[PDB]
Amino acid sequence: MVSKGEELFTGVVPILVELDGDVNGHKFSVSGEGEGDATYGKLTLKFICTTGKLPVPWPTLVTTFVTCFARYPDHMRQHDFFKSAMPEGYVQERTIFFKDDGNYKTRAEVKFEGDTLVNRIELKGIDFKEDGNILGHKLEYNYNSHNVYIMADKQKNGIKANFKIRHNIEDGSVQLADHYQQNTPIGDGPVLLPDNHYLSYQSALSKDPNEKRDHMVLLEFVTAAG
């Protein structure tokens, strides 16, 4: 049998992303739009900084900017927490520790508003170096592929993960961003709590040649594996 959650993702779904951020008192907002195709694990999104210049590097926001679009193959269908929480949705919380620099704390509500999948995010960053790799914009506009290990958090009726992103610094070095994550349902209904597994990510960053606002184009694929 196919569940309500699963059924919401059988075709291409429009996505809206909204982020309000404050990093060391530098306030900013980002909107994003695009589409998700969970059958392929495919996200196509374009983000605009609506407040002017983004005060942090675009790559540092990629993980923050809808795991319900992951491709869970049929044999893993009983392990897809993210879709099982829909349409009421889930809250994704992270702390992202930038090594030798500050940290982001993020809280995102991921839920349907009609036929649109919304990712609504608040991001708070503190303890950054005003001349470091983040506030000083010293990170390259590129991205690595990663596997992220997902575990059930049965007590919390959700999932957790921790993983490392390694941003490339312009001098050839690496800026580590250590991610700690917890997701919990918004509603009171049943969800699927998964066996341990991983999600395989690839992300490609580009620019729209006709866009004069500060922006990022993201093509990302997310696939579950045992």
Curated annotation (Swiss-Prot):
InterPro entries: GFP (IPR009017), GFP-related (IPR011584), Green_fluorescent_prot (IPR000786). This is Green fluorescent protein. Changing N196S: In EBFP1.2; shifts the excitation and emission spectra to shorter wavelengths and increases quantum yields compared to BFP. The keyword Nucleotide-binding does not apply. Changing S173G: In GFPA; leads to enhanced fluorescence at 37 degrees Celsius. In Venus; leads to yellow fluorescence, improved maturation and reduced environmental sensitivity. Gene3D superfamilies: Green fluorescent protein. Changing D101E: In mut1.27; shifts fluorescence lifetime from 3.03 to 2.85 ns. The lineage of its organism: Eukaryota, Metazoa, Cnidaria, Hydrozoa, Hydroidolina. Energy-transfer acceptor. Its role is to transduce the blue chemiluminescence of the protein aequorin into green fluorescent light by energy transfer. Fluoresces in vivo upon receiving energy from the Ca(2+)-activated photoprotein aequorin. It comes from Aequorea victoria (Water jellyfish). The gene is GFP. Changing I126V: In EBFP2.0; shifts the excitation and emission spectra to shorter wavelengths and increases quantum yields compared to BFP.
